[PDB]
Design a protein around this nucleic acid. Structure first.
Lengths: 69, 119, 53, 143, 101, 145
RNA sequence: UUAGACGUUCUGGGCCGCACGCGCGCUACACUGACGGAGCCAGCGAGUCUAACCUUGGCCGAGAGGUCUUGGUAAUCUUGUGAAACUCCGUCGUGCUGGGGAUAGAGCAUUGUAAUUAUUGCUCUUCAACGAGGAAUUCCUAGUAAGCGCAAGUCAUCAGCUUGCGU
């Protein structure tokens, strides 16, 4: 079903597809990509410490992110 | 081969009823911690006195009683007891693995169902 | 005959009873009243329990 | 111009103070810190298994700061919640008392609360001095 | 002189307030410091029986109430005038207790 | 930013105590498919075996799994207190055992057969296939199955 | 009917017994969620003198609970009843799964003269049906419906019930 471990063929799919995502979120990752949900909640952290997406609101039950540029 | 909680069966009989409770479960430990004036001597005198009737042959005379709420102790091993179910005394020989149980566990108080099928 | 009344009555419905009719059913023991439901309803007015709202 | 812990957000103070207690490393966490459920209404142990005890010690010290004095019976009612007893409805259940008593004894040994007249435990001379210093740093975190 | 306290308890408003009024009226007939009547919150004692004997009918419920009004007055007086004022104002339905200190 | 790129050491379904453990769920709840461990026993044995709880089961190289199954089969030697234990002063030994994967259905069978051959009231209810605890039967418990 | 009692009292048992049909309900079928930390907010009330009631605080214990004391005959003490839903942060990630907790095993306690046909509480283990319920059918118009707990009655012990109360 949904992948829970990065396999370096999903990793480059992260970097070259989330800039095309104008709305990006936990449920956005698991629908268009096939990712484990808890991997998405780690990915949205990783996509913030180096800016590829930017936060507009961070609630514990809902994260909302847009492309940085 | 039979042991209760690590002590052998030949260690059970050569052991007082106080030392048996010290390794019993919590219900048995609680009852005889507050078991003063429980009147235990009237029944237990008739059990040892019935073991002298049979020298070496088959099981002793039954000792019928109403006390369904009495915990089986190792001094009762080998005796036979008629336990009042409410209308009738049922003889049950006290097997060694009956320790810590109530006498009412071995005399049912109802004839179960037999739903239909008159036959 | 030393077994005549020997069963303990120290708690539960067998010990307490109504002080007007000596029943065990429907007892009211709020504020130490000890009167049955039906007896209390006939003399709540004398005790001082009126019915306002 | 001078701040108390009442000018700091509760969650942001307790997290910041819990980290400070662990960095000092002198609290004498009990050996049973990783076995216990912390209430009989709970189902599972605390998830942050390394530093859940420092968060109770930080939460309790702020609570004693804001109140006059409390004892281990008031903390059990505070930290307890509803219990799922399956097919029967929920009800309030008090928390574990051994944990709160060990927290209070640890705080007395570090010397941040003290035994009080009228019972319970009040916050101490060093308690106000030390709670307010981390209270000062938490305001000035924003660069 | 001595510090005294008079506590009044009744189930009747009209029979209690005039008794406390007589207490204070005798208190400034010969003047002394009042600490006048501090009315405690009224207590409503509720008994909720069902309605009936036997449970036939709609499940209708009654509630009966007894209302307890309580008042205490904290006076100080010489020892002589204590007994007379505690004995003159005696009225049915009103329970008066006097605490010595 | 906890992204890790391990690719080769991951493993699918794997056997522990003769049970297929799912390899791609978190280890504490992956162990709970073993009959005899639960969400709170497995948590404590992972803590005692010193496993990072955030790992999937496809992690946990074989010496860590060997440590884990050492803890499960012998808890009291690794400071687990005797009140987690599934059997305490059990029925014959007086020792403290935590019953595990295949022994759970057998020790239960041992206990039922032990109190069936004595003709205790619990045993007769078990043999008849009725509710052995003191609970009503007139309206519930239908569809014996 | 009234002495071999239909009076009364005592030991046991039953009222709870299960092929099955019905009525009131409780918990659910999960992400508007479960779990773990953190925040922290009521109102109605009840409570012991020749009797052991409500119990703060210290100590012990994983917990249930134990123990040493204390306050209160009460707008004074329990009690600000620091209630629960709720709120914040994190773990889970659409999988009858970390939803659900029926059924069952082993132990530790508490009330009671007495707990077996589990009184009840707790600890570990066991992990059932249930994926939003056919014909039918109930209640309800604003601080109402619904969600959420709390006190009291019954009580020695037992609340999935009721009478109220607030959120």
């Amino acid at each position: 079903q949904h992948a829970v471990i990065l396999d370096q063929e999903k990793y480059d799919r992260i970097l070259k597809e989330v800039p095309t995502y104008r709305y990006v979120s936990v449920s956005v990752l698991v629908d268009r990509l096939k990712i484990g949900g808890s991997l998405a909640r780690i990915a949205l952290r990783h996509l913030e410490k180096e800016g590829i997406i930017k936060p507009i609101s961070k609630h514990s039950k809902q994260a909302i992110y847009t492309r940085a540029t | 081969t039979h042991s209760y909680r690590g002590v052998d069966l030949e260690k059970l009989l050569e052991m007082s009823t106080e030392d048996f409770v010290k390794l019993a479960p919590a219900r048995v430990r609680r009852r005889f911690a507050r078991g003063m004036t429980s009147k235990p001597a009237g029944f237990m005198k008739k059990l040892r006195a019935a073991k002298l009737a049979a020298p070496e042959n088959e099981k002793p005379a039954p000792v019928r009683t109403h006390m369904r709420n009495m915990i089986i102790v190792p001094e009762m091993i080998g005796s036979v007891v008629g336990i009042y179910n409410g209308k009738a005394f049922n003889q049950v020989e006290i097997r060694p693995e009956m320790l810590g149980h109530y006498l009412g566990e071995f005399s049912i108080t109802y004839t179960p169902v037999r739903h239909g099928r008159a036959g | 005959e030393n077994v005549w009344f020997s069963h303990p009555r120290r708690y539960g419905k067998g010990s307490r009873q109504c002080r007007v009719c000596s029943s065990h059913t429907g007892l009211i023991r709020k504020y130490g009243l000890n009167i049955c439901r039906q007896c209390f309803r006939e003399k709540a007015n004398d005790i001082g329990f009126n019915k306002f709202r | 111009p001078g701040v108390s812990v009442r000018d700091v957000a509760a969650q942001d103070f307790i997290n910041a103070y819990a980290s400070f207690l662990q960095r000092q490393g002198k609290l004498e966490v009990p050996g049973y810190v990783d076995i216990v459920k912390t209430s009989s209404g709970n189902e599972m142990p605390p998830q942050d298994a390394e530093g859940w005890f420092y968060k109770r010690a930080a939460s309790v010290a702020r609570h004693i700061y804001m109140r006059k004095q409390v004892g281990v019976g008031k903390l059990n009612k505070l930290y307890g919640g509803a219990k799922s007893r399956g097919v029967r409805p929920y009800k309030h259940i008090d928390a574990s008392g051994s944990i709160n008593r060990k927290v209070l004894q640890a705080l007395e040994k570090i010397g941040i609360v003290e035994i009080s007249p009228k019972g319970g435990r009040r916050i101490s001379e060093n308690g106000q001095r030390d709670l307010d210093r981390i209270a000062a740093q938490t305001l000035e975190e924003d660069e | 002189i001595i510090k005294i306290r008079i506590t009044l308890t009744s189930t009747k408003v009209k029979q209690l307030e005039n008794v406390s009024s007589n207490i204070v009226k005798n208190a400034e007939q010969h003047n002394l410091v009042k600490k006048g009547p501090v009315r405690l919150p009224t207590k409503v004692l509720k008994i909720s029986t069902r309605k009936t004997p036997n449970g036939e009918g709609s499940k209708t419920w009654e509630t009966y109430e007894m209302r307890i009004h309580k008042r205490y007055i904290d006076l100080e007086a010489p020892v002589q005038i204590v007994k007379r004022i505690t004995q003159i104002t005696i009225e049915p339905g009103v329970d008066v207790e006097v605490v010595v200190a | 930013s906890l992204v890790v790129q391990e690719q080769g050491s991951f493993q699918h379904i794997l056997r522990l105590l003769n049970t297929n453990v799912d390899g791609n769920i978190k280890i504490v709840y992956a162990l709970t498919t073993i009959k005899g461990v639960g969400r709170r026993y497995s948590n404590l044995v992972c803590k005692k075996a010193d496993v990072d709880l955030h790992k999937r089961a496809g992690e946990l190289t074989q010496e860590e799994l060997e440590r884990i199954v050492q803890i499960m089969q012998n808890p009291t030697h690794y400071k687990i207190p005797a009140w987690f234990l599934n059997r305490q002063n059990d029925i014959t030994d007086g020792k403290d055992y935590h019953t595990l994967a295949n022994n759970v259905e057998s020790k239960l069978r041992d206990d039922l057969e032990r109190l069936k051959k004595i003709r205790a009231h619990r045993g007769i209810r078990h043999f008849w296939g009725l509710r052995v605890r003191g609970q009503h039967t007139k309206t519930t418990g239908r569809r014996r199955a």
